[PDB]
Amino acid sequence: STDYWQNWTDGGGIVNAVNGSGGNYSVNWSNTGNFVVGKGWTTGSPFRTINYNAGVWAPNGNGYLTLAGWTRSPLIQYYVVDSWGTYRPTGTYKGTVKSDGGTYDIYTTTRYNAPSIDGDRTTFTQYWSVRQSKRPTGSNATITFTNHVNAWKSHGMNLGSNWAYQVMATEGYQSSGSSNVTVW
Numbered sequence: 001s002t003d004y005w006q007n008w009t010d011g012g013g014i015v016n017a018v019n020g021s022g023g024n025y026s027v028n029w030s031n032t033g034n035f036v037v038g039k040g041w042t043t044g045s046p047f048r049t050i051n052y053n054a055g056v057w058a059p060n061g062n063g064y065l066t067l068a069g070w071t072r073s074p075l076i077q078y079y080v081v082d083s084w085g086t087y088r089p090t091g092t093y094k095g096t097v098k099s100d101g102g103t104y105d106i107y108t109t110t111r112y113n114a115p116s117i118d119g120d121r122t123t124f125t126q127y128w129s130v131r132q133s134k135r136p137t138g139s140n141a142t143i144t145f146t147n148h149v150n151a152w153k154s155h156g157m158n159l160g161s162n163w164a165y166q167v168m169a170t171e172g173y174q175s176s177g178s179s180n181v182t183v184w
């Protein structure tokens with residue numbers, strides 16, 4: 001089951017995150033900076049199948065409903081974005097991957113002098129799978145993460161050997177909204 005609660009805010013606006021029972025959490029946010037809230041696992045796995053149900057997905061502005069995680073060796077942040085608000089994240093286009101009923105575009109981005117799990121000022125690459133259209137929410141959904149890892153790997157996108165957290169997240173920037181998600 002899930003063993004990790006992520007609740008990070010850069011301190012802008014309100015992020016009211018509720019660590020609920022089991023794999024359940026909610027977030028109600030207002031006029032935020034950057035934040036990431038979610039439930040999953042202390043130690044991520046390239047093999048894991050993440051199940052979730054987003055009972056509420058109501059961003060007003062930039063929010064992502066996304067698998068979010070990190071590796072070290074090297075330091076990489078990765079995403080599998082299923083839904084969003086006013087902004088679909090993109091970057092350097094690498095290809096596509098089909099998984100769990102949808103097609104995702106694959107992208108890489110680079111962050112400079114940015115907060116990471118290794119410091120408040122670091123340089124790192126982000127790997128993305130971004131669904132081509134918003135995934136319906138409210139039903140039980142799967143993300144077969146092995147499919148994304150294999151697709152990324154085949155496009156020369158190597159994850160680090162040391163796996164950090166891995167969560168089904170609400171991430172926001174400069175936005176308001178409400179979400180309710182259960183992860184298992």
Ligand SMILES: O[C@@H]1[C@@H](O)[C@H](O[C@@H]2CO[C@@H](O[C@@H]3CO[C@@H](O[C@@H]4CO[C@@H](O)[C@H](O)[C@H]4O)[C@H](O)[C@H]3O)[C@H](O)[C@H]2O)OC[C@H]1O
Nearest residue numbers: 024051052053054055056138139140179180181182183184
């Ligand atoms: O205000 C309302 C919110 O409280 C509500 O919260 C949602 C409650 O429904 C959630 O979806 C549940 C999650 O659990 C699923 O069962 C799993 C089935 O697979 C098993 O292996 C696993 O052990 C079970 O836990 C269940 O089928 C599903 O209905 C949802 O995630 C919450 O966000 O949302 C609606 C608001 O109006």
Ligand SMILES: O[C@@H]1[C@@H](O)[C@H](O[C@@H]2CO[C@@H](O)[C@H](O)[C@H]2O)OC[C@H]1O
Nearest residue numbers: 008034035036111114115116117171
């Ligand atoms: O690019 C942004 C990242 O810089 C941000 O990283 C967060 C840094 O603080 C850590 O405690 C968090 O766990 C980590 O997610 O993530 C959001 C992204 O937009």
Ligand SMILES: [Zn+2]
Nearest residue numbers: 095096154155
């Ligand atoms: Zn490919």
